């Protein structure tokens, strides 16, 4: 028995997608609901929009944009061309919003149902879709990210803790540079890191949730995963004790590093995917490594939460759309019997209402 389940949802090449467009710059998956692919067919640039609830009927529309990102929940699409940003409601055939920046946008992403984050060479902005909002600057970029390829941006649930991640080549390895910014303190901290997520976690005996910051890094010393509370604990709460654990890379994976993280708050577990397609599962509370295996030969270059299972969904370079999630019937007996860790097994069983710790 295995503590995780691995599923294929789609092969994009079966929908006529050119494998040259299956990559970070042309294929976006902002949630598990849609995949957008920018393609050129003859003379005309187009966007192919795959509705994951109706995947054999993609729509193709002409575009003149250098990037397209679908809203996480609705058929509302953001497109840009240099400094021009436009937002469309597809079913209304309507241009919702248009804005002209004074800098090119090198990376952008939906960070919520109604806010787009914009990263320029110099700063990070948030742009709300509510009312007549224009972009608001959140922070200036830290010099440690200068010249990096920006690969991710995320926030905590309350948008008070913000995290920008870039990568570059240094001493012949891919080095991660992160900028953590506190909205309330107006302070940044540079941190070496490859993939990260925030999470809400309520410790037993606390009345309020803790906001945790989790990141994984392959540093010069090796792989590490950190889980740390950000901010002052809510009044009355005990602080979450920080955790730090090794992230293992086998000897043949000397050039591998973390590329994606999703945290399930249903099960309080951390999914980590590496550049060369390894999947790890960690306990969010302790950092304990529950499971590692290999899910792809090809790099998985984009991921999202898989809402139905509280797992992770991703696309690889071949165009396989794959998800991983906790096997709810197996995880507890796996931890008890294979990991020989009845203490973690019993804690997780009661913490997340999972079967299997009736016998330890």
């Amino acid at each position: 028995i295995l503590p995780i389940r691995f599923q294929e949802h789609l092969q994009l090449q079966n929908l006529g997608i050119n494998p040259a467009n299956i990559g970070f710059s042309t294929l976006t998956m902002e949630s598990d609901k849609f995949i957008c692919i920018r393609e050129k067919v003859g003379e005309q640039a187009q966007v192919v929009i795959i509705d994951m609830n109706d995947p054999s009927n993609p729509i193709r529309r002409p575009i003149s944009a250098d990037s397209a990102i679908m809203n996480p929940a609705s058929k509302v699409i953001a497109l840009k061309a240099g400094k021009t940003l436009q937002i469309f409601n597809i079913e209304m055939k309507s241009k919702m919003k248009a804005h002209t920046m004074t800098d090119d946008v090198t990376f952008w992403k939906w960070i919520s149902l109604n806010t787009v984050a914009l990263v320029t060479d110099n700063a990070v902005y948030h742009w709300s879709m509510e009312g007549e909002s224009q972009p608001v600057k959140m922070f200036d970029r830290h010099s440690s990210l200068a010249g990096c390829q920006i690969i991710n941006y995320r926030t905590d649930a309350k948008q008070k803790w913000l995290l920008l991640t870039g990568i570059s080549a240094q001493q012949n390895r891919v080095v991660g540079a992160m900028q953590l910014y506190s909205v309330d303190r107006k302070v940044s901290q540079p941190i070496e890191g490859h993939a990260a997520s925030f999470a809400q976690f309520k410790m037993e005996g606390n009345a309020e949730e803790s906001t945790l910051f989790c990141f994984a890094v392959r540093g010069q010393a090796g792989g590490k995963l950190h889980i740390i509370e950000v901010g002052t604990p809510p009044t009355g709460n005990q602080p979450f004790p920080k955790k730090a654990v090794d992230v293992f890379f086998p000897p043949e994976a000397q050039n591998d590093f973390p590329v994606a993280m999703q945290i399930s708050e249903k099960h309080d577990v951390v999914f980590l995917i590496t550049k060369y397609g390894y999947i790890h599962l960690y306990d969010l509370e302790t950092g304990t490594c529950i499971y590692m295996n290999r899910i792809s030969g090809e790099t998985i270059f984009v991921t999202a939460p898989h809402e139905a299972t509280a797992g992770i969904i991703g696309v690889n370079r071949k165009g396989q759309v794959l998800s991983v999630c906790v096997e709810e019937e197996n995880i507890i007996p796996y931890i008890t019997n294979v990991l020989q860790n009845p203490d973690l097994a019993l804690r997780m069983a009661v913490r997340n209402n999972l079967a299997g710790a009736e016998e330890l």
Partner: peptide, 6 residues
């Protein structure tokens, strides 16, 4: 000063 100590 700093946000986090690890």
């Amino acid at each position: 000063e700093t946000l986090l100590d690890l």
